């Protein structure tokens, strides 16, 4: 099975595959690559979202003005929760448009993670090789190219760190949202959440 070879097993669960429900044993390898790709996607989105929520709750905002009429602090003066509404429609439209472009490109690369590809290694130069489209060769992952200074063993260690931090952030972001929704749910979250 492909499960025994993947990363993600850590010292916390005794260095064993944490699958109480046994779905990893049940489903085929193809679904397992889907699950690892989705795991890393959720984990990276959550590692972005958790620090975003921290910054919003601290009310740390860039100096300037998002639109020509609203300030970054004006949007953030109602906590992270009531922020996406206060963002202008055009700004979030552009954000979601570039996210759509990235998603479509990463899915459109030929060596798909399911059908013979590394799960979670979305291609580092999306929008390249597209007929009738030119974009700068800004490497999506690590455009400064910090990876070049790391050997494969260090990359494996940092991928383990990636998975563990992603899992913790997926817990933390929902913790923040739940702390806002239900006031007493998560302790150690102040009224800003």
């Amino acid at each position: 099975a492909l499960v025994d070879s993947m990363e993600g097993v850590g010292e916390e669960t005794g260095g064993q595959i944490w699958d109480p429900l046994g779905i990893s044993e049940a489903v085929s390898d193809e679904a397992v690559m889907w699950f690892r790709a989705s795991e890393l996607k959720h984990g990276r989105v959550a590692m972005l979202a958790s620090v975003g929520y921290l910054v919003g709750a601290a009310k740390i905002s860039f100096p300037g003005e998002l639109a020509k009429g609203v300030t970054f602090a004006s949007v953030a003066a109602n906590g992270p929760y009531q922020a996406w509404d206060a963002v202008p429609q055009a700004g979030k439209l552009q954000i979601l448009s570039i996210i759509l472009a990235l998603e479509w490109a990463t899915e459109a690369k030929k060596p798909h993670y399911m059908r013979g590809g590394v799960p979670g290694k979305i291609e580092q130069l999306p929008f390249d090789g597209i007929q009738g489209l030119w974009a700068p060769k800004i490497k999506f992952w690590d455009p400064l190219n910090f990876t070049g200074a790391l050997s494969a063993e260090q990359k494996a260690r940092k991928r383990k760190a990636e998975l563990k931090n992603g899992r913790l952030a997926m817990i933390g972001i929902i913790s923040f949202i739940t702390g806002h929704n239900l006031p007493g749910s998560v302790p150690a979250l102040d009224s800003s959440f």
Partner: protein, 179 residues
């Protein structure tokens, strides 16, 4: 990073890197670091020279900056962040657009981009239009590049000393309390 320029006698004879970002940096990451260092150097040197010249009783340019709106060079006060504030927004956009065109050029024209081989901080269009440094020895050019980096590091500390003076009065000694 040991091969790259910048290690004068002023920090031993070795690289200055407490945090060790150069250790993380690969060759192309070090190229990015040097390119960013150089661009900050050059922009800072221009900024600090302009601030000093304007706010040290230098001769403001003659005539009207904008004849249509009536804004004049003399009307723009010789004070940091007031002259820029009173400059027309169209003029601000002119400066920013020319800078943006030039920077997209310096990114798209250089062929072996500083990232993929190449030399960080080389912009053939703007440097030496009169060719002032076209017959210097390679050593001399290396020495002058070292001088460039050293002057610019000081310049980028100085421009922030000016900025933090306006935004936080009496931050810098030997500088007016206002700006």
């Amino acid at each position: 990073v040991s091969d790259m320029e910048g290690t004068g006698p002023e920090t031993g004879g070795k690289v200055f890197d407490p945090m060790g970002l150069s250790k993380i940096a690969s060759a192309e990451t070090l190229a990015w670091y040097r390119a960013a260092e150089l661009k900050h150097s050059r922009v800072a040197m221009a900024a600090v020279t302009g601030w000093a010249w304007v706010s040290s009783g230098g001769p403001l340019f003659p005539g009207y900056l904008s004849v249509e709106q009536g804004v004049t060079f003399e009307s723009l006060g010789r004070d940091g962040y007031a002259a820029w504030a009173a400059v027309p927004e169209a003029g601000k956009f002119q400066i920013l657009g020319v800078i943006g065109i030039l920077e997209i050029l310096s990114e798209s024209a250089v062929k072996p981009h500083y990232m993929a081989g190449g030399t960080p901080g080389k912009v053939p269009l703007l440097w030496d239009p009169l060719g002032f440094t076209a017959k210097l020895s390679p050593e001399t050019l290396a020495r002058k590049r070292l001088a460039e980096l050293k002057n610019g590091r000081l310049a980028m500390i100085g421009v922030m000393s000016l900025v933090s003076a306006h935004f936080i009065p009496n931050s810098v000694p030997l500088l007016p309390g206002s700006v």
